[PDB]
Amino acid sequence: RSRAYTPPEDLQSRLESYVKEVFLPSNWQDISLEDSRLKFNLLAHLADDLGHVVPNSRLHQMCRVRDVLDFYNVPIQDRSKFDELSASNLPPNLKITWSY
Amino acid sequence: EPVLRKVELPVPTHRRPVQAWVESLRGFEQERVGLADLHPDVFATAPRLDILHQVAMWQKNFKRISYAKTKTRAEVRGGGRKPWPQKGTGRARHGSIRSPLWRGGGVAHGPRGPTSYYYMLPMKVRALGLKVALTVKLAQDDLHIMDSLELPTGDPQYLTELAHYRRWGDSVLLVDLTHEEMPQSIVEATSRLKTFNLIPAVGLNVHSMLKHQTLVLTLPTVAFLEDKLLWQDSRYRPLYPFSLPYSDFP
Amino acid sequence: ARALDLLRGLPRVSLANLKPNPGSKKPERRPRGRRRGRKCGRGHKGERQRGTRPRLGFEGGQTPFYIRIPKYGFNEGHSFRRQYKPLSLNRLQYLIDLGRVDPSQPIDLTQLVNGRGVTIQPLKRDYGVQLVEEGADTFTAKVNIEVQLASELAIAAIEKNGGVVTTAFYDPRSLDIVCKPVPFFLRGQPIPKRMLPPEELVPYYTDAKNRGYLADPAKFPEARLELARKYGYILPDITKDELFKMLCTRKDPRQIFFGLAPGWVVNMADKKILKPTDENLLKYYTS
Amino acid sequence: IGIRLTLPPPKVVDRWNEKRAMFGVYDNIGILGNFEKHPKELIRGPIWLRGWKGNELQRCIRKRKMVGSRMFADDLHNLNKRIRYLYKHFNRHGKFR
Amino acid sequence: FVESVDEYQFVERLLPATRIPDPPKHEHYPTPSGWQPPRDPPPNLPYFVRRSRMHNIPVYKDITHGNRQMTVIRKVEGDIWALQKDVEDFLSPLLGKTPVTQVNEVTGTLRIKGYFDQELKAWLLEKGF
Amino acid sequence: YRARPPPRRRPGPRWPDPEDLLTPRWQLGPRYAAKQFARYGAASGVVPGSLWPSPEQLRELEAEEREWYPSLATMQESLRVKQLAEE
Amino acid sequence: LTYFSARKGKRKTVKAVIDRFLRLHCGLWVRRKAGYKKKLWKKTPARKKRLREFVFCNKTQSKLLDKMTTSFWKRRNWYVDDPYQKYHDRTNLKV
Ligand SMILES: [Mg+2]
Ligand SMILES: [Mg+2]
Ligand SMILES: [Mg+2]
Ligand SMILES: [Mg+2]
Ligand SMILES: [Mg+2]
């Protein structure tokens, strides 16, 4: 259970496969998620699979399948600032310590 | 099957309702049991942090009564007669040994008596303050909605482990609809914890939504809050208090 | 909104982030320092610095403005003059259009209060509503109003459209029970009987020209006919249409509410009406 | 030299006390408990200032008429003299009139 | 003495409502008072203006200092900057100059200098709000 | 923690004991009884026959009505007399 | 005046002011002219016509009279056949 997310490379076909398995026509990226059961099944399958869930703050924002598609291909990367600074390719005269 | 709490009150035509996951506390790793949508005029109003500051300072200060009192130059003991005559001595002219310049005298402008700091904001501003707290908790991703607060066991350590696993926060405000019908398990679990607090839905305020990092509603409390807060919009000016009987109120 | 979408990226709102709307809190000025206090705003030592400036109106010794002037009775009997809140026909058409006043029922004063069309306060000695001729043209409503005063042109504007006006009277007590009836039925008292007008107002409410509630129902067609001739409209007969049984209902004098009678005790709790059957009470309440 | 030489004992404050954790609950008992109580019926204090705010002359007048009959003798006497003083101050002294 | 009867119907006509009623459906519009409901569907402008409790369009006059005449459009939800552009494009033939305004993006108001209440109410009825 | 139970009103009439000396005088008249009847109905309040006037109160009311509140006949008659004398 | 009474802690009106002046709701105080009923035998009819007039008050006289009365006296009054009623609302000012 770690908030790091790295989007898959077969995400188009997986997501499309889930859209067919919840249903199916062409132009499937413009399917409205107005039906609430359809949205719950689609995002519940994706959360079960990818381990990455659409938050409550964004859950109303996807009204098409394309928006879920655009959500599941942002890399949410989670580590401490000590691990972000020390990995940002420091010059040889910066030294950072964490008295924590 | 899911749990899909559609919105009961009439939404405006130009706003679609805002959705949220429904979770449960039964499963230690069982979130996302259903998907409730929520009324946009109570869970997606304008941010409005100024009103949070109004309602937070109202809640702090209206109940406040300061008991600080000091004694004035009349109330302090003795000091009725001139200490020395007006003119003849080389000392300063004094009238009592209890004037505020003396060591032991009264206080010139000290605190006087119990003072009350009572004031009411209008009830539409308190109600709007509750709405704003709800949209802010939902937008910051701190609202979580349960179907019921029924735990598989009554230990505190279960609930802290659950709150640690789902990355809630240091302090959780659990809200159930009534005080009578709160499940025995959540009562036994949260009656021992310092930071996880049970409150009935009547007890919901703004100081304790800001004090706690996460806030946890149940679906009956969500319908309750939509009902009680969307009522303040679209209601007449009162003829007399709403405790008195009306055509349609309770 | 883009603004909640801003709230994602920001740290959580807490009791440590809050701040008043800039402009709300002016800062307190207090007499410390070089500017706010050495003489502390009182000026040089006189009587206004010591704190003892004389009362408001004192002109230093010449006879003050507010006393050089003769007493005249502008405000002589101010608290016994009767007041009547205006209700224009523009206002009443407005209330009928927005569902707030149902014109398929009689419009008593309770129905104008419960629609919150008119706020009348019996203390501050309002004796009720007066109809007002404003908005007489563009008044298209068949209505039955009971309004304590009415100008001729307002009676004409209602009675043109197939309406009925009558002018009732209310005591301060009676008016007070009429406006807010529900805090009277929690008072436990039986419904009183409204009193007849005083001698100043009996010639008002007994005239058929201004549609008095104590006037003849035999002199009304002459007055309706006279206004219909004066303001140039053909007087419709109310007898023909279907609302006639509604447009005829009045409560008699000494009746405050519509379907009820004086002496009844409304039991709001278990939804009953207790009626007295003693003969002395019935002589007193049906007087 | 009125300054202390050793720094004082630390002020241990429990932010998750019973009082602090439950502060502010039932401030909205009116607006979401069907208006059966006002919030001013939540405050505890002197009987003459529960849900009432006044300046000092008004606090003294209200205290005298609400509780003054069972006040102690020289407290009643001090309070009569305070109303008499504060009367003569608010009504006859100041800058603005 | 007592003789209890359920003729309580006449009491139920005396109880005031709490919720302000939905206005009734009329045949033609506008109504004799000049009221007119918001149109369905809502128009596809960038912004939106609510109605009030009382279903009136919310343009209010406002005086301060005894000489600041000004007008407030108040329940504005959406992009207030499009509304400021469109109001400023609407009033400038009635003035010659652009009207001096102030958006309050927080509350969602827009504040114009000088009384233009009837013109903005008529204008916002035209726009469909 | 758990919130202490929400403060509620008393579900029924408060009858103060008359023999107590710190019961204020407004809580033990007949108006308090009529008011408690009005709030709580026949079940919780009082005998309903107490709400009307007793015949002593009835004759006091009748006396006041005869003194200050004349009839239309006498009102109109005094108006005929004043119009007559004025004209 | 009395800014805080000893019984209520409220402001009090000066009753001389009410006894002599008329507050119109727009803020204008009307008064009667001083000496309008004195020594009429030695006044020219122009002057007597001037004294029998209802004269408005100054700005500072108006604010002095506002401060000496209370909010009861500043209130709308819908009397029945009021003579001064057409003078309450202020028509057609351009500031
Ligand atoms: Mg002494
Ligand atoms: Mg001395
Ligand atoms: Mg001391
Ligand atoms: Mg001392
Ligand atoms: Mg204003």
PDB file of C-alpha atoms in Angstrom, chain G residues 3-85:
ATOM      1  CA  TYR G   3     -27.083  58.214  26.768  1.00  0.00           C
ATOM      2  CA  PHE G   4     -27.744  55.306  29.100  1.00  0.00           C
ATOM      3  CA  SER G   5     -30.775  55.431  31.382  1.00  0.00           C
ATOM      4  CA  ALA G   6     -30.590  53.982  34.887  1.00  0.00           C
ATOM      5  CA  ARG G   7     -33.526  51.613  34.368  1.00  0.00           C
ATOM      6  CA  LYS G   8     -33.144  50.322  30.820  1.00  0.00           C
ATOM      7  CA  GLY G   9     -29.653  51.442  29.798  1.00  0.00           C
ATOM      8  CA  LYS G  10     -31.145  52.944  26.605  1.00  0.00           C
ATOM      9  CA  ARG G  11     -30.949  56.419  25.044  1.00  0.00           C
ATOM     10  CA  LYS G  12     -33.692  58.867  25.832  1.00  0.00           C
ATOM     11  CA  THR G  13     -35.326  61.448  23.638  1.00  0.00           C
ATOM     12  CA  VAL G  14     -35.373  65.064  24.568  1.00  0.00           C
ATOM     13  CA  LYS G  15     -39.057  65.823  24.674  1.00  0.00           C
ATOM     14  CA  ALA G  16     -38.612  69.537  23.997  1.00  0.00           C
ATOM     15  CA  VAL G  17     -37.452  68.493  20.553  1.00  0.00           C
ATOM     16  CA  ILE G  18     -40.521  66.442  19.839  1.00  0.00           C
ATOM     17  CA  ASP G  19     -42.715  69.138  21.227  1.00  0.00           C
ATOM     18  CA  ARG G  20     -41.411  71.707  18.704  1.00  0.00           C
ATOM     19  CA  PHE G  21     -40.224  69.922  15.550  1.00  0.00           C
ATOM     20  CA  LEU G  22     -41.411  67.539  12.856  1.00  0.00           C
ATOM     21  CA  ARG G  23     -39.149  64.847  11.469  1.00  0.00           C
ATOM     22  CA  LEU G  24     -39.905  63.941   7.858  1.00  0.00           C
ATOM     23  CA  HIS G  25     -38.746  60.422   6.952  1.00  0.00           C
ATOM     24  CA  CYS G  26     -36.243  61.699   4.389  1.00  0.00           C
ATOM     25  CA  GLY G  27     -34.342  63.439   7.210  1.00  0.00           C
ATOM     26  CA  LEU G  28     -35.701  66.983   7.038  1.00  0.00           C
ATOM     27  CA  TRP G  29     -36.887  68.656  10.213  1.00  0.00           C
ATOM     28  CA  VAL G  30     -39.762  71.076   9.871  1.00  0.00           C
ATOM     29  CA  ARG G  31     -40.284  73.841  12.387  1.00  0.00           C
ATOM     30  CA  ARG G  32     -42.418  76.876  13.045  1.00  0.00           C
ATOM     31  CA  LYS G  33     -40.919  80.378  13.020  1.00  0.00           C
ATOM     32  CA  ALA G  34     -39.996  82.068  16.281  1.00  0.00           C
ATOM     33  CA  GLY G  35     -42.364  84.876  17.234  1.00  0.00           C
ATOM     34  CA  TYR G  36     -45.124  83.946  14.775  1.00  0.00           C
ATOM     35  CA  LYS G  37     -47.770  84.778  17.346  1.00  0.00           C
ATOM     36  CA  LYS G  38     -46.123  87.716  19.084  1.00  0.00           C
ATOM     37  CA  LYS G  39     -46.759  91.431  18.552  1.00  0.00           C
ATOM     38  CA  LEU G  40     -48.668  90.972  15.328  1.00  0.00           C
ATOM     39  CA  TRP G  41     -49.982  94.532  15.573  1.00  0.00           C
ATOM     40  CA  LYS G  42     -46.550  95.968  14.760  1.00  0.00           C
ATOM     41  CA  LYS G  43     -45.564  93.596  11.940  1.00  0.00           C
ATOM     42  CA  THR G  44     -46.040  94.270   8.238  1.00  0.00           C
ATOM     43  CA  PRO G  45     -48.221  91.679   6.423  1.00  0.00           C
ATOM     44  CA  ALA G  46     -45.225  90.488   4.394  1.00  0.00           C
ATOM     45  CA  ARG G  47     -43.472  89.690   7.636  1.00  0.00           C
ATOM     46  CA  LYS G  48     -46.558  88.079   9.131  1.00  0.00           C
ATOM     47  CA  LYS G  49     -46.846  85.970   5.966  1.00  0.00           C
ATOM     48  CA  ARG G  50     -43.203  84.977   6.484  1.00  0.00           C
ATOM     49  CA  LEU G  51     -43.733  84.002  10.116  1.00  0.00           C
ATOM     50  CA  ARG G  52     -46.745  81.788   9.409  1.00  0.00           C
ATOM     51  CA  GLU G  53     -44.605  79.339   7.468  1.00  0.00           C
ATOM     52  CA  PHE G  54     -43.308  75.843   7.997  1.00  0.00           C
ATOM     53  CA  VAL G  55     -39.610  76.310   7.613  1.00  0.00           C
ATOM     54  CA  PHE G  56     -37.072  73.520   7.061  1.00  0.00           C
ATOM     55  CA  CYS G  57     -33.998  73.194   9.250  1.00  0.00           C
ATOM     56  CA  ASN G  58     -30.273  73.449   8.677  1.00  0.00           C
ATOM     57  CA  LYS G  59     -27.979  70.494   8.127  1.00  0.00           C
ATOM     58  CA  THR G  60     -26.332  70.747  11.537  1.00  0.00           C
ATOM     59  CA  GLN G  61     -29.623  71.591  13.188  1.00  0.00           C
ATOM     60  CA  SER G  62     -30.957  68.438  11.542  1.00  0.00           C
ATOM     61  CA  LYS G  63     -28.099  66.274  12.850  1.00  0.00           C
ATOM     62  CA  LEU G  64     -28.431  67.845  16.311  1.00  0.00           C
ATOM     63  CA  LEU G  65     -32.107  66.934  16.295  1.00  0.00           C
ATOM     64  CA  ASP G  66     -31.391  63.399  15.094  1.00  0.00           C
ATOM     65  CA  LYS G  67     -29.008  62.847  17.995  1.00  0.00           C
ATOM     66  CA  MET G  68     -31.537  64.136  20.516  1.00  0.00           C
ATOM     67  CA  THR G  69     -34.333  61.731  19.545  1.00  0.00           C
ATOM     68  CA  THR G  70     -34.387  57.977  19.136  1.00  0.00           C
ATOM     69  CA  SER G  71     -35.195  55.495  16.404  1.00  0.00           C
ATOM     70  CA  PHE G  72     -38.894  55.513  17.263  1.00  0.00           C
ATOM     71  CA  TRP G  73     -39.087  59.025  15.888  1.00  0.00           C
ATOM     72  CA  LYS G  74     -37.188  58.153  12.716  1.00  0.00           C
ATOM     73  CA  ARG G  75     -39.729  55.581  11.523  1.00  0.00           C
ATOM     74  CA  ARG G  76     -42.257  55.275   8.659  1.00  0.00           C
ATOM     75  CA  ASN G  77     -45.699  56.326   9.720  1.00  0.00           C
ATOM     76  CA  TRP G  78     -48.630  55.422   7.538  1.00  0.00           C
ATOM     77  CA  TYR G  79     -51.268  57.705   9.045  1.00  0.00           C
ATOM     78  CA  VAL G  80     -54.792  57.898   7.695  1.00  0.00           C
ATOM     79  CA  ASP G  81     -55.236  61.445   6.373  1.00  0.00           C
ATOM     80  CA  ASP G  82     -51.829  62.835   7.161  1.00  0.00           C
ATOM     81  CA  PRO G  83     -51.278  66.430   5.960  1.00  0.00           C
ATOM     82  CA  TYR G  84     -47.521  66.061   5.614  1.00  0.00           C
ATOM     83  CA  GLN G  85     -47.521  62.623   4.006  1.00  0.00           C
TER      84      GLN G  85
END
